[PDB]
Swiss-Prot record, chains D, G, H:
Description of how the protein assembles with itself and partners: Homotrimer. Interacts with major capsid protein.
Family: Belongs to the lambda phage gpD family.
Keywords from the named record: Capsid decoration protein, Capsid protein, Host cytoplasm, Late protein, Viral capsid assembly, Viral release from host cell, Virion
SUPFAM superfamilies for this protein: Head decoration protein D (gpD, major capsid protein D) (SSF51274)
Gene Ontology cellular component list: host cell cytoplasm; viral capsid, decoration
Cell compartments where the protein resides: Virion; Host cytoplasm
GO-annotated biological processes: viral DNA genome packaging
Record has Flavoprotein as a keyword: no
Region Disordered: start-end pairs: 1-27
Protein name from the UniProt record: Capsid decoration protein
Function: Stabilizes the expansion of the capsid head shell after genome packaging. The packaging of viral genome in the procapsid triggers a dramatic reconfiguration of the capsid shell, expanding from roughly 50nm to 60nm while the capsid thickness decreases. 415 capsid decoration protein molecules cooperatively bind the expanded capsid, thereby stabilizing the mature capsid shell.
From Swiss-Prot, chain F:
Family indicated by similarity: Belongs to the lambda phage major capsid protein family.
Subcellular location per the Swiss-Prot or TrEMBL entry: Virion; Host cytoplasm
Protein name: Major capsid protein
Gene: E
Taxonomy, superkingdom: Viruses
Residues of the full protein shown: 50 to 98 of 341
Length: 49, 48, 48, 109, 47, 49, 109, 109
């Protein structure tokens, strides 16, 4: 769309028994594809770990 | 079954009846059983 | 004798347009039918 | 202009054999082919089926004959089409017309 | 007893599930060694 | 969905999936025809007189 | 534990061919195969044999059906084994059942 | 045509150990597995849970038994799924069924 790309996301996640959409019905997000995001992971609190 | 053609798509057969009234016949035998592995692959929209 | 085949189709893939908004009670010039197509093809389980 | 459709003529409805037999007859008028017969209750002489005495069907005529014919040749087996066999107008309901020959090797398809 | 059953192909039925978010904005991953985590940001406004 | 259970008490045993079969056995068809050798006496609509 | 007694499915008892027929059906209850039939006393439709009306047998049902079947298909010739025929519960005399089809092409052997 | 659903047989619902025990039994009828048991008030034999007495549940039967079985093997600890236990028809309330084994080592998930 010029400087901006248009992406349609219809991913679905499963609840206890049903299927639902990740995003609400009528929303958009404006951001940078180079924006920094963190995938931080905690400590494994298991006895064997 | 006598010719070992149990597994076949179609099967033609021609024959004639004995006796003083003689009549021939013709038949095609088969068993078409269309199936779909994934019934949910398609969506049948009925418009109005 | 009757033989009934349940291929396994769900009710989510038998959309019936019946109601008050199917396609014939819409404006010919303003409405876009592609949204209905993309909505009906959402529950397809594979490429269409 | 005029049309003369050439349609075939198949009285049999199934591949079952259609046997025949002969018996004395007591017809009162001309009876064409495939006219059902009944057995008289007085002298037991074959006549045309009246279409009212239920269960009186005995056979279907195979050769045209009139009241001068002493012997009638009638079928006693096989399957026949409804549209080809000539049944009397006395029987008006189709259900009773179908099962008139039950109990005998003759059948109607 | 006498059944003689032959099985044909099966089905798959997986989800329509593609992240688009663990691949576009969250490309960088870190583990932890601590309990809490800070996230500082300096307000850069010169005079 | 993957529950957020605390790492102290326990975790529930998620029931395994799989298993559904059906049969669609018999099928048949047979369109018999006759020959009735007495129709060959007359002429067909083709085969000009 | 549980046995698997396997008997070959041979309804016929002789080399006599078994000829079939079709006629309107008026069943009042579900009727499996090998079920004897009579004609209705009033509507002359085909109903299950009661086992008490003498001479009412006219044929043996060929395919399973119910009240939703307008027309039944039944055998009209040949011989059948006495043990394979699903006799009605009312008919308690073996001798009467063995000769219940006399006067018709159906026979019990 | 017909449909048969195959589901894995998992009576357990948690990693809790399932310890078995043996005791005299006083059943009066056929009782399949996964059946709750209670103590007889007079003879203290094991009987099928009536589903009305509060706190009478003492365990879940592990192996099938009949009235002639003088010894019964039943679970005495662990966690069991709700849908896998053959609850008596008298206990028609979900909450009481889910808390019927409370106070013992048996739990319902």
């Amino acid at each position: 769309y010029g400087d901006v790309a248009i992406v349609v996301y219809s991913g679905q996640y499963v609840e206890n028994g049903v299927k639902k959409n990740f995003l609400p019905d009528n929303t958009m997000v404006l951001g940078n594809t180079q924006a920094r995001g963190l995938r931080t992971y905690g400590c494994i609190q298991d006895a064997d770990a | 079954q006598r010719e070992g053609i149990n597994a076949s798509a179609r099967y033609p057969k021609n024959w004639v009846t004995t006796g003083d009234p003689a009549r021939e016949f013709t038949m095609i035998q088969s068993a078409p059983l269309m199936l779909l592995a994934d019934p949910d692959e398609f969506v049948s929209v009925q418009l109005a | 004798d009757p033989v009934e085949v349940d291929m396994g189709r769900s009710e989510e893939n038998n959309i019936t347009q019946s109601g008050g908004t199917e396609w014939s009670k819409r404006d010919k010039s303003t409405y876009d039918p592609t949204d209905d197509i993309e909505a009906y093809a959402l529950n397809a389980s594979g490429v269409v | 202009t005029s049309k003369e459709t050439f349609t075939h003529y198949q009285p049999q409805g199934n591949s079952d054999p259609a046997h025949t037999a002969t018996a004395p007859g007591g017809l009162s008028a001309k009876a064409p082919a495939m006219t059902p017969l009944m057995l008289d209750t007085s002298s037991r002489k074959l006549v045309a089926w009246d279409g009212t005495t239920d269960g009186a069907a005995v056979g279907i005529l195979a050769v045209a004959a009139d009241q001068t014919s002493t012997t009638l040749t009638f079928y006693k087996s096989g399957t026949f089409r409804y549209e080809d066999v000539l049944w009397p107008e006395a029987a008006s309901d189709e259900t009773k017309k179908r099962t008139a020959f039950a109990g005998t090797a003759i059948s109607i398809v | 007893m006498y059944t003689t059953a032959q099985l044909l192909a099966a089905n798959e039925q997986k989800f329509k599930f593609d992240p688009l978010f663990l691949r576009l904005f969250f490309r960088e991953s870190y583990p932890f060694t601590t309990e809490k985590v800070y996230l500082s940001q300096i307000p850069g406004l010169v005079n | 969905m993957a529950l957020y259970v605390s790492p102290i008490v326990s975790g529930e045993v998620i029931r395994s999936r799989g298993g559904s079969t059906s049969e669609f056995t018999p099928g048949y068809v047979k369109p018999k025809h006759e020959v009735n050798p007495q129709m060959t006496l007359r002429r067909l609509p083709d085969e000009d007189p």
